[PDB]
Amino acid sequence: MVQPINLIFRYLQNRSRIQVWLYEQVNMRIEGCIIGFDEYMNLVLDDAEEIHSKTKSRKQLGRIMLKGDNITLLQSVSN
Amino acid sequence: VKLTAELIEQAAQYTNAVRDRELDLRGYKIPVIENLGATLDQFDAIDFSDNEIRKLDGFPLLRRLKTLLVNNNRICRIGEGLDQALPCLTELILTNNSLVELGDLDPLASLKSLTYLSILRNPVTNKKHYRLYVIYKVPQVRVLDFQKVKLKERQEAEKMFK
Amino acid sequence: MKLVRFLMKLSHETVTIELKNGTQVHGTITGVDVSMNTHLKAVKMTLKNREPVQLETLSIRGNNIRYFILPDSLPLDTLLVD
Amino acid sequence: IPNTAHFANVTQIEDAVSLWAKLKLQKASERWQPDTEEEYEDSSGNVVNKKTYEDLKRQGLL
Amino acid sequence: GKSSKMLQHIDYRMRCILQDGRIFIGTFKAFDKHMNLILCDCDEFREKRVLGLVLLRGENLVSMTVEGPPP
Amino acid sequence: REEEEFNTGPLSVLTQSVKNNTQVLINCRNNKKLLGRVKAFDRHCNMVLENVKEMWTEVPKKPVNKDRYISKMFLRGDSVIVVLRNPLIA
Amino acid sequence: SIGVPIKVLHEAEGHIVTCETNTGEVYRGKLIEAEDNMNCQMSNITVTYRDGRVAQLEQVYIRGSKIRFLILPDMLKNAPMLK
Amino acid sequence: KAHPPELKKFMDKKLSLKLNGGRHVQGILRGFDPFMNLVIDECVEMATSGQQNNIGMVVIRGNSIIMLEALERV
Amino acid sequence: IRPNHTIYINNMNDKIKKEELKRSLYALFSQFGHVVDIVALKTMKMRGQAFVIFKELGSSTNALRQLQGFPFYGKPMRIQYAKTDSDIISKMRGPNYILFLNNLPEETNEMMLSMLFNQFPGFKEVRLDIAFVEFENDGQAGAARDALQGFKITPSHAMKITYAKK
RNA sequence: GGAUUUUUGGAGCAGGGAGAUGGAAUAGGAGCUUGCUCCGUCCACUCCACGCAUCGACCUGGUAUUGCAGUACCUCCAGGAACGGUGC
């Protein structure tokens, strides 16, 4: 049995780039490197980028504090 | 034993086989259907079988009334204000009644929501071209005497008496 | 401090409640619980682009109520003292 | 259930109804009920059939 | 205090309006802290839909009113 | 603990509205902005206000804007989206 | 700690019932597992949605978060549900 | 309180999960959580045109979980 | 087959909808009595057949006798008695005064005679190929004598019921 | 007792484009009635991209099943698409 909190801790220790999809919003997602987490699934992304699938654009913001109530799915990317 | 508010408040009401709120008013021998305002349109079907009602009239405004059981009665005339009191009346069972002429079916044409009508075991059904006259006078009815109305019967009703 | 104790002491008053779907129900507040369960008697409800309907009783939940409307002669200064 | 000395110091409902069923069975058993308890031999064959109750005899003699 | 708002309408036919615009008219038998309504032999109006015993959750409830006398 | 967090956090921005009797605006999720003086607040942002003015815009379903006034009202903290404090009472 | 509709849903496990979701999906079948948080796990279930896409699956699991209503048979509405 | 969901029988089984906004994924579950969070290793998501895209090990939260159908006989 | 409260009609039109056919069967059965339940399926095993369970057995017998071979949606349905008892009925359940019976089966017990006489209301007692049934009411005994004159019970023989003499 | 399955809400808003197309009986403004011209609100038809694909309910014709049960729904073929929702 693999826990999701242990997988999030392994992804934060590996410092790999992960993409987070929003809830009830399939057009725009976020992508970045998760540095830390909390009990409320609050992600701290360094040099994050908002990717819009409809317009095919990417806007960088930097240090972003994403709440866990909006992130619906999180996948690991190689970029 | 006339139909009053105390007889309607003491009558049994439950769910029928079609999952509709039906009140069983059978076994009362009411000579005239009246004092139906105590139900406050809370019943979807009316079970008035085995009664002595002579005219199907005197009913108040009930938008929830969709089925009316008038089987085993002596109904010989229909009221002209049936559409103003029951706009959502779709089921009308008038089997074994006292209807003899087709002219009593002329106030029944005002019910645009009526789709199922039963006029079996009546002397009006034994007359010549009774089904064609019922199809021509009431085009909104789809099932007449447990029989589906076809296009050929509608064409025969629209051809004659046009 | 707690708004539930202030809302529970507003019984026998003709108020109005506007929901999130645009339906406004005006009536006399008769029962208020800890979960803001508003039980009113002889209320009038008007939905979005619909006709107003009068009911003898109504029970609206606390999560479905968006805003409230109190009369101007309501003692809000005296009812705020716990 | 009638009030008798049998239903004394009994305070619960179901106990009372069960003891009433018991007393009913006992008394109804110990009476003499001629309708079901009787041996008639009808004159239909007049030398047979003594298993006739008190009701079948009237039906045969009617 | 008394909490008799839900106990007075017990074993009675009530019509509850949903958030999407549906209306379920059924006999309210029991409730809970999450306002879970159990409507035995309920009808769905918006057309008539035969449902029967429908256990609707309290999250999709908006308003409830009395429909008629108890059966 | 609770009083220090209410007087030192964001709720102090509400507590400056009831102590000094200032006017603040509340933008809700129904595209309506109500400007008024906050009279009673709570931990769940239950705002009971007096002398409120609510403005919005509506379509015939060109559209047009509209506004109205209420003597005393109460709004729950769920529908409150934005709360802005500005020196508008002076 | 356990509600009476929760107890009625737990007592109706093993009967042919249906669960209509908030999106309109109706999972129908035998209720194999029914927890206190309205978690309905069914075996040999059938999907009849408001979309109408009727299919048959071996196992389905619908949580109580997006569950709108539940249609149960009237075999348990008489006893011991009479209060 | 805080009872975990009954996900012991669906462990290491290929199931299809539905997420809000009309999302569909298919993969093998690798664990459970009391907050209904599921870890799907080697998951494949269905696009709008119908093509399947492999996203690898993903984590789906319980706030957007709609329905999980087991494609294997348990 | 013994008469029961549930009457099963078969050889009907299976092209109509299930709810419309159930409503038509309820409207047909409402003229003879109160219909308690209507069981109608459209599967491959129960295609084109349905049944109506009523409160009284006499209304179901009158509906089976009157609507025997009646045209229903173009096809003449055949009505008959049910083989087993209904679940709803099992859940809800749990001239002269003396009548002379002749040519009665010896294998029938007193419970079968009580179930046969239960179409009439409550009688005084029963006496047991000859039998004597005495009722408490004169009209009930007359209706039982008029109903059991040639009844369909144990069809290897014919049962005859007549009024007793003085 | 406002941080994922119930009560302090992730809800709000808008229905593709064109055509010397058609109508506001009593309800638009301006060129300061009436007639005409212009511009930010619908329905009916036609054209491109019957908006698209899906399944359920449903209507016509042909066709198969005669079977004793407590039910999401129940034969198949072809045409039409009045309805529902899903993703773009």
DSSP line for chain I: ----SEEEEES--SSS-HHHHHHHHHHHHTTTS-EEEEEE--SSSSTT-EEEEES-HHHHHHHHHHTTT-EETTEE-EEEE-SS--HHHHHHH---SEEEEES--TT--HHHHHHHHTTS--EEEEE--EEEEEESSHHHHHHHHHHSTT--SSTTS--EEEE---
Q: What residues does C57 pair with on adjacent strands?
A: C41
Residues 6 or more apart in contact with residue I6 via CB below 8 angstroms = I39, I51, I52, I53, I54, I60, I81, I82, I85, I86, I89
E50 touches chain B (CB under 8 A): yes
From the list G33, G45, G66, which residue is nearest H6 (CB)? Answer: G33
- DSSP category for residue C61: -
Listed by start position, the domains of chain E span: 1-71
**Residue E47 neighbours by CB distance under 10 Å:** 5
Cβ-Cβ contacts under 8 Å, F26 against chain C:
none
Q: Is residue H8 within 8 angstroms of chain G, CB to CB?
A: no
Hey, what are E4's tokens? 């008799």
| Contact check, Cβ <8 Å, B14/E71 | yes
What is the SS3 assignment for D19?
Answer: helix
Contact I164 D59 (CB under 8 A): yes
The answer to whether C15 and C68 are in contact (CB under 8 A) is yes
Rounded to 5 degrees, φ, ψ at F68 are: -155, 170
Which of chain A's residues 12-31 bind strand J, using a 7 Å CB cutoff? 22-26
Q: Do I133 and D35 touch (CB under 8 A)?
A: no
Q: How far is C24 from chain F (nearest CA, A)?
A: 14
Chains meeting D at 3+ CB pairs closer than 8 A? I
3 state DSSP class of F6: helix
Name residue, tokens 């058993």: D29
Tell me which of D54, D55, D57 to substitute to probe the interface with I (most I C-beta atoms closer than 10 Å).
D55
Q: Can you tell me the distance from the alpha carbon of H37 to that of G82, in angstroms, rounded to the nearest whole number? A: 38
CB contact under 8 A, B19 and E51: yes
C69 within 8 A of F54, measured Cβ to Cβ: no
Contact predicate I60/I54, CB 8 Å: yes
Contacts of I59 (CB under 8 A, 6+ apart): I32, I33, I34
Q: Which chain J positions come under 7 Å from a protein C-beta?
A: 1-14, 40-41, 54-61, 63-75, 84-88
Whole-Å CA distances, H74 to E29, G42, G56, G58: 37, 12, 15, 8
Residue numbers 46-65 of A with CB closer than 7 A to any atom of strand J? none
Residue linked to tokens 């003899």: B100
Alpha-carbon gap, residue B155 to A45, rounded angstroms? 75
CA gap B48, B82 in Å, rounded: 16
Of I19, I30, I71, the CB nearest to B69: I30
Measure, in angstroms, how far nucleotide J51 C1' is from residue G58 CA. Answer: 36
Per the CB < 8 A criterion, the answer to whether B24 and B45 are in contact is no
Q: Nearest nucleotide to G48 by CA–C1' distance?
A: J72
- Does residue H49 sit at the A interface (CB-CB below 8 Å)? no
Alpha helices (H) along F1-90 = 2-8, 11-19
Question: How far apart, in whole angstroms, are the C-alpha atoms of residue H61 and residue H36?
Answer: 6
DSSP letters for G7-56: HHHHHTTTSEEEEEETTSEEEEEEEEEE-TT--EEEEEEEEEESS---EE
Residue F83 three-state SS: strand
Distance from CA of B13 to the nearest CA of I (A): 13
| Alpha-carbon separation of residue I108 from B158, I5, I131, I153, I162 (angstroms) | 62, 21, 11, 10, 19
Residue B151 CA: distances (Å) to CA of A18, B108, I21, I73: 65, 21, 21, 15
Residue of B nearest to E66 (CA): B42
Neighbouring chains to B with at least 3 Cβ pairs closer than 8 Å: E, I
When divided into structural domains, chain A yields a total of 1
Report CA Rg, chain D. Answer: 20
At residue B101, the 3 state secondary structure works out as coil
CA of A58 vs chain H CAs: smallest distance (Å): 20
Other C-beta atoms within 10 Å of C34: how many?
13
Q: What are phi and psi of F6, to 5 degrees?
A: -80, -30
Are B70 and B86 spatial neighbours (Cβ–Cβ below 8 Å)? no
The β-bridge partners of C25 are: C17, C45
Nucleic strand J near CB of residue E47 (< 7 Å): no
Contacts of H59 (CB under 8 A, 6+ apart): A4, A7, A8, A73, A74, H37, H38, H39, H40
Q: Which helix (H) or strand (E) holds C1?
A: none
Which residue in chain H is spatially nearest to G62 when comparing CA positions?
A: H67
Cβ distance of D56 and I128 shorter than 8 Å:
yes
Q: Is the CB of G54 under 7 A from strand J?
A: yes
Task: Report CB contact under 8 Å: C6, F48.
Answer: yes
> SS3 of A7, please?
helix
- Kindly report the nearest CA distance between residue F49 and chain C, in angstroms: 10
Phi, psi of G75 (to 5 degrees): -85, -20
| Residue I13 CA, nucleotide J76 C1', distance (Å) | 17
Q: Do G71 and E53 touch (CB under 8 A)?
A: yes
* Alpha carbon distance I96, I86 (integer Å): 36
- The CATH number given to whatever domain includes residue I59 is 3.30.70.330
Tell me the C-alpha distance between G78 and H23, whole Å. Answer: 42
As a whole number of angstroms, the distance between CA I160 and CA I150 comes to 6
Using DSSP, state whether B25 is helix, strand or coil. coil
Q: What is the resolution of this structure in A?
A: 2.7
Containing structural domain, residue I37: 6-90
CA I43 → C1' J62, Å?
Answer: 22
DSSP secondary structure string, B32-97? S---GGGSTT--SEEE--S----EE------TT--EEE--SS---EE-TTHHHH-TT--EEE--S-
Q: How far is C4 from chain E (nearest CA, A)?
A: 12
- Distance, CA of H53 to CA of H59 (rounded, Å): 16
Query: Sheet of I123-127: strands edge to edge?
Result: I123-127, I130-135, I98-102, I160-163
Q: Assign B104 to helix, strand or coil.
A: helix
What angle separates helix B151-159 from helix B130-137, to the nearest 10 degrees? 90
CA nearest E42 in B: which residue? B19
Sign of dihedral through CA atoms B11, B14, B17, B19? positive
Cis bond before residue F63 (omega within 30° of 0): no
